[PDB]
Ligand binder design. Structure first.
Ligand code: NA
Ligand code: NA
Lengths: 294, 294
């Protein structure tokens, strides 16, 4: 095991977060990641406050360990979903789709750790100023809605610009990537596609099979750009409910398969426990390898 | 100094290559990088055989150390430029814009090290089979014509797929990036924009100033996609001679400023010697930092 400012901040064992996408970020997958020592994350993007309350309850029936809730800022229920996180003492809240400054203070005053997802250097500095505990720097190789900067560049610039810990997201699916992210300045990694491709993930079996089969070149950017698998529906687009149809129904015809380029690094569906074991082992072997040079 | 399979293969001191873009890859910049212990590279993309012959001669008037020539496969003079490299005993030849399999054997039979630039896992395996000595895995954050895969993903997958050394290109401008690339599996790095932004680079002063001022978000992908600075001409395009107008004339109006996202990591024009010194120092500090975790 490796210790970082992020495992200290979040009071977890491993510096590894799952994605917490809508529909795929279920309490079942989040509970598995958290119990395994990482940070499971409930994706509330498609949730109403009642749905999130239930989701939090069923996660806590499985694990006592820390967990996060991801809130999409453009959701009509965003204010109320933040209020749910405060009332249910959610330990960690991540944000997507913009600047969550308006919520940071009330979350922090009530003891929640706040970690906005950013695709820019300027936004990172802004949310640091507004009180963020850490930031996720998400490169555009990730799946779903994306920014413009790649992980290799973004993590480097963001970590140099802030003093709070940086978490790298996008393109990370193994221990090599964890070491590479740490070299760029990150102190944890978020691996959305890798944990969607797990035994404990409840995405449709077809979703898992497509990730396994997909190469590093099998995603496309369509549209507010978003990265999805090169599926028939992604061709026809070049949208409402399309992500749910892929995740829940495995619909190859009109599902949007929001997966990142790291799908080309994923060749089999693994248990969450094995994923975390293999990451840590390869991270350590990679660092020993680098040490050989100096 | 750090030793890798690439410094052994190329018989150079440091595992650091410059870009060798057309117009910017001049003998003056290449000679400076090679004499400083890296691999300077003459960019022949806009050259006729006579031009390349002269270019090689003037580089050798400055340095006795190894150097490369980059050949663009779609150039009408590609066959003849390869023949020039054979006759003038060019130690290293890189290729861009496709599959250079048809030339590998004659170059290798005459003692030249052949390093194709690839943007895919499949092409990398193909050129390995055809006899390549190493491959440059170039992520789409680089400037100029680009593939689809980012460095973070591409270097990882490519290095796992071949046994020959992999050189990482795209997004690398400092020692952190060198360590990150090595973690993903690379054994050298190519830093086009970083060496264009050098005292010994002969690109127009405006070109250098734009790189310095540019942030990580100040490039755009236009068109055969190509990454350029967010300039008025890049807006109007959304082309013939446009790269020369930027590099040679510093034309903000109709120059194509082919620079990568790593321009946002570059805040000043440095001597080539200092660039290489700072890379090596930060690479070693980064590896020591990673060692702290294990
Ligand atoms: Na795959
Ligand atoms: Na800059």
């Amino acid at each position: 095991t490796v210790r970082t400012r992020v495992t200290d901040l979040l009071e977890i064992e491993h510096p590894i977060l799952m994605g917490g996408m809508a529909w795929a970020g279920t309490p079942t997958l989040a509970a598995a990641v958290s119990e395994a020592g990482g940070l499971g994350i409930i994706g509330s993007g498609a949730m109403k406050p009642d749905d999130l309350r239930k989701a939090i309850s069923e996660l806590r029936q499985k694990t006592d360990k820390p967990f996060g809730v991801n809130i999409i800022l453009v959701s009509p229920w965003a204010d109320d979903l933040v209020k749910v996180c405060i009332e249910e003492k959610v330990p960690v809240v991540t944000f997507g789709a913009g600047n969550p400054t308006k919520y940071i203070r009330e979350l922090k005053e009530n003891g929640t750790k706040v970690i906005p997802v950013v695709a820019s250097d300027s936004l990172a500095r802004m949310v640091e100023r507004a009180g963020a505990d850490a930031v996720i720097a998400e490169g555009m190789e990730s799946g779903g809605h994306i920014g413009e900067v790649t992980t290799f560049v973004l993590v480097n610039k963001v970590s140099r610009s802030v003093n709070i810990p940086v978490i790298a997201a996008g393109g990370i699916a193994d221990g090599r990537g964890m070491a590479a992210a740490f070299a760029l300045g990150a102190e944890a990694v978020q691996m959305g596609t890798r944990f969607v491709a797990s035994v404990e993930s409840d995405v449709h079996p077809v979703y898992k099979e497509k990730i396994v089969k997909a190469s590093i070149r099998d995603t496309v950017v369509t549209g507010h750009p978003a990265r999805v698998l090169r599926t028939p529906f992604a061709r026809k687009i070049q949208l409402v409910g399309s992500l749910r149809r892929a995740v829940v129904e495995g619909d190859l015809e009109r599902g949007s398969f929001a997966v990142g380029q790291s799908a080309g690094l994923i060749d089999e569906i693994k248990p969450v426990k094995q994923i975390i074991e293999d990451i840590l082992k390869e991270f350590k072997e990679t660092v020993e390898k680098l040490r050989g040079y100096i």
